[PDB]
Write a protein that binds this ligand. Structure first.
Ligand code: NAD
Ligand code: NAD
Ligand code: NAD
Ligand code: NAD
Ligand code: XT3
Ligand code: XT3
Ligand code: XT3
Ligand code: XT3
Lengths: 268, 268, 264, 268
């Protein structure tokens, strides 16, 4: 008997089999959830990736910058899960920032057109997904997004840090709106996981400093985490998200759960 | 469901069937946990109270101020759960503060002897329980204590606030020690629940200020919580603790989970 | 001897004589600072307002959305304070959010074009000002922006809350950049002050707004809070522009009567 | 001319000319304050140390664990500053923790009698000092204590971390009491300064680890602080305290000002 038996959950943000969203979906399925997946831009590729999941699941296009995709999303989900059924959970596992807002590119040289795009996708879209999907969510349901602790500044993450600070504020407002429907909204602040975004976005922006990134991640997380931290294992983050999709954190909303091995609780 | 199937968990802090610990134990048992219970001072009464749980469970004396009780605790638990078995979870649901450190008694008039006693039982005992029990916990295990958000001052809670600020710090250190054993340590910051200790804050169930207390608790929690808050329902807090005793938050330690309906995330 | 004797400080954000920036400038001047002022859009009006300050001060146009204004700003400031002199302080006291992102307008109905504009002006501009001005700041100097505590959600402030959360993060990054020049960057999280922007949050129910501000601030503040008195906020900013908080950067000072430290 | 012209300020916590309190007093005096000083245990020594201040100032015995010293303190201060005059400021720069609660001594082995003592002196005494002195403080006045950021756990500081978490909570309650008198109460969270407490208490407790751990700390502070940090220079901390004793932060109470070079705002 699974933790998410007969729960219908939408999971956004799969692009490879390392994606945090991919492992969220895998664990959600292992625990009995029926999924609907959304993907951006490269749907042929994403389709081959989602075939490696333990179960088949419908896949829908969603570019969170596209008003038409958002306006139609609720309709397309209803059609995929059966007319008269609703969602019990929604997972926002999406982010973007142009190269200029990251890495060794100077912080002050990022033009606002680039920063604005990153905040649109990384923070505002949390509200636009909730707006589109709350009308088809059941009471008891849960919305979850992915965060990276932005309360202190750090090298390289630069304007993505600013986007996450924004996302944290958005989550608290979404929680107010979602409360009317009996729905929780929370973020999971994950420790670092090797994914495409880590490597191509953050690691690409670092140039020949990429060694520096690993060293910092080692300092900031495995060394600090009292139970350690393994950047090649997304399972603990995925389980944490499933905990929030479940009935087992029923009194938590507008909040942030840290799945970082405890690193943020330790100074060194 | 079986969230805690075949997990052996020690639960401290039962005194009535309204105790947060009582509901923690009930839900743990409903989810398949084999419990060991500890009780303070009034064991005859506590025995009759624990009989109302869904399953029988051994009951052990533990006054956290008593060195002998603590020195023997590990031994007595091993005897109750079977030689060669260990605990998978531990719940600290314990607190105390003398009357002088609370309510309308002026903050500056609490003598240190009284405050010290309250900090001993409410904060330091979180470390002494961990010290006694870690040697008989399995890797994967979880220690959980109960908090009330002390980051801002408030009427009446007075020196208990100071004890909770201390407990929050103790938890982060216990997390470091527990990490060596592959064990997590976390607090649940609960919203207010009608218990015997709550009445104590204002001098018993008809204290001068009882009416004021209820109004403030409604202002601070049900009115702020986006999903609302019901002070007569401990279940959501109990489920939140079981979430932490389970395998489903494996990467969270040294931390605090808020089970307050989201109230601490909202200003008004 | 005044607290800012012979310090050259740029102050942005004056629009009326209730503007927080206006009272910052007044106090800075009372304490011996030579000011340069910047104003947006309504410079004729702003000029008449700045005439009510204790001392005359040059006034420069700056729309923080305008790349040309920002590119020329350093040059225009050098010309106004004398070639070979630099700034010792900079005050960002600027904000904006379209009506759709605020008040009773549902949170979800604000389009991103509107939210983006508000974040541009209210948060990103803190970085673009620092970028423009750091090259002409002296070691020891201080940059200060105005914040409103966004760590918990609230009625009406809506997307401005999100812009302030962003500003807080921007400040921490600016602090890193400013450190290279020996310059501090901090925000002052003020309690509520009756200004033109405050009326904008709703328009001018206003009754509800005042009640909430009394609940959230005067009632919680252990030393009380008076929304018609900007002086304490202005002094707190001058403290940060002075030499007296030399080891504080990337940080937030709360000038709210202590309200954020009390739950009820 | 001076920032504290004609302000009468009590400064506790001088033991050597490296003490943070000694530099607070020096700068206060340079800025025109008339001081009253308090000292613990070694008054002969403290007297020779205070002679090296720019101005003479009366010195009073105060062991914050002694009820008689506290009961008589207001009276003795009135006598020293002139009957009818009051204090405008009070500086608590006092701390203690037994060796067992610090360094490489295991966290769980500190007996509560030792931790209690440390909390008494390091946290509760901030309330007793305020209780004794508020009745002779002018409206506008300021109380200030010294903190070391305890929001995350760390090596070695151990139970002192817990005492600082307690102090932070006590400061918020003192702010409530002090508000009735028109008085502010705040802490300054200083970066690390080479003082007797650093070397004898913390450094002593580290044993053979003292040298390396302290060097890494000095490197990592200075590394995180965007404006850098020099552990041999107390002046910036002393100035920060004088800012709070002055009229220039009139709307800040119950709060914490970080004088750490910005280090706590940066993760790495
Ligand atoms: N990798 C880490 O260590 C880490 C840690 C904590 C949080 N995060 C967050 O987790 C989330 C997922 O990142 P990940 O590491 O799995 O990376 P990723 O590259 O696997 O995923 C990023 C996803 O965002 C999608 N995306 C980008 N622009 C989009 C748009 N306009 N519309 C819809 N989808 C769009 C991509 O298509 C992709 O599926 C992000 O919010 C990221 O900040 C990453
Ligand atoms: N009830 C609430 O609103 C609320 C909210 C948040 C946190 N909490 C915390 O929850 C915990 C439990 O309190 P409760 O509300 O269940 O009340 P309660 O009165 O039911 O239980 C408190 C328990 O503490 C025990 N205790 C006291 N001194 C002890 C000692 N010397 N040794 C061992 N046990 C001792 C008592 O025997 C009792 O079982 C406390 O830590 C309290 O601060 C309560
Ligand atoms: N009044 C309050 O209660 C309060 C509380 C905390 C923080 N704040 C902050 O203080 C700052 C000033 O607000 P105030 O209440 O004194 O307001 P205000 O309405 O007096 O001033 C707002 C100013 O922003 C300027 N501005 C707007 N868009 C601009 C742009 N593109 N370029 C340059 N200037 C631009 C306006 O011209 C005006 O000078 C803001 O950042 C605001 O968020 C206000
Ligand atoms: N030095 C640092 O790196 C650092 C950083 C931040 C905060 N602090 C804090 O600053 C304060 C001052 O410590 P310091 O480094 O100046 O060291 P220190 O040893 O110079 O000063 C400590 C003082 O505490 C006094 N004291 C101890 N027990 C007392 C008692 N029973 N009654 C009265 N006074 C008592 C001692 O006599 C001494 O004057 C402490 O609260 C410490 O926690 C230290
Ligand atoms: N999706 C997405 C995404 C978009 C922009 C930037 C990062 C994105 O994904 C992340 C991918 C990885 C991480 C974790 N992380 C952050 C970093 C940097 C590099 C130095 C260490 C600390 C900051 N390295 N790993 C956080 C993320 O938000
Ligand atoms: N065990 C225990 C215990 C010991 C002393 C004081 C309280 C204790 O348990 C609690 C009991 C109730 C609550 C919740 N609560 C808080 C308050 C104050 C006073 C009324 C409004 C502001 C919070 N009243 N009830 C929190 C608790 O930690
Ligand atoms: N400049 C500017 C500005 C731009 C958009 C929105 C607000 C702006 O300035 C402010 C003006 C007033 C306040 C304080 N405030 C907040 C509020 C509402 C009222 C209900 C409770 C708190 C949110 N009322 N006043 C904070 C501000 O940042
Ligand atoms: N007075 C006093 C006092 C009492 C007990 C312990 C420390 C005390 O003063 C301090 C002396 C130094 C510091 C700063 N600090 C912290 C540390 C440890 C060293 C290991 C790494 C960082 C934590 N070393 N210095 C902080 C202090 O509160």
């Amino acid at each position: 008997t699974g933790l998410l038996d007969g729960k219908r959950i939408l999971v956004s943000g799969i692009i490879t089999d390392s994606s945090i969203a991919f492992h969220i979906a895998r664990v959600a399925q292992e625990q009995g959830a029926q999924l609907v997946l959304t993907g951006f831009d490269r749907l042929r590729l994403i389709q081959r990736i989602t075939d490696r999941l333990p179960a088949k699941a419908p896949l829908l296009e969603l570019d969170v910058q596209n008003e038409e995709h958002l306006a139609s999303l609720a309709g397309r989900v209803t059609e995929a899960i059966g007319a008269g059924n609703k969602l019990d959970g929604v997972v926002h596992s999406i982010g973007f920032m142009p190269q200029t807002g990251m890495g060794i590119n100077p912080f002050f040289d990022a033009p606002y057109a680039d920063v604005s795009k990153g905040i649109h996708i990384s923070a505002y879209s949390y509200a636009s997904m909730a707006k589109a999907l709350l009308p088809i969510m059941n009471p008891g349901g849960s919305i979850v997004g992915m965060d990276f602790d932005p309360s202190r500044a750090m090298p390289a993450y630069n304007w993505m840090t600013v986007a996450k600070s924004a996302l944290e504020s958005v989550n608290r407002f979404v929680a107010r709106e979602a409360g009317k429907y009996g729905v929780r909204s929370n973020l999971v602040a994950a420790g670092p996981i090797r994914t495409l975004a880590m490597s191509a976005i953050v690691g690409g922006a670092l140039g020949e400093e990429a060694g520096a990134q690993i060293q910092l991640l080692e300092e900031g997380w495995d060394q600090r985490a009292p139970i350690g931290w393994n950047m090649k294992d997304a399972t603990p983050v995925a389980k944490t998200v499933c905990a929030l999709l479940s009935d087992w954190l029923p009194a938590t909303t507008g909040d942030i759960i840290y799945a970082d091995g405890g690193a943020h609780t330790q100074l060194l």
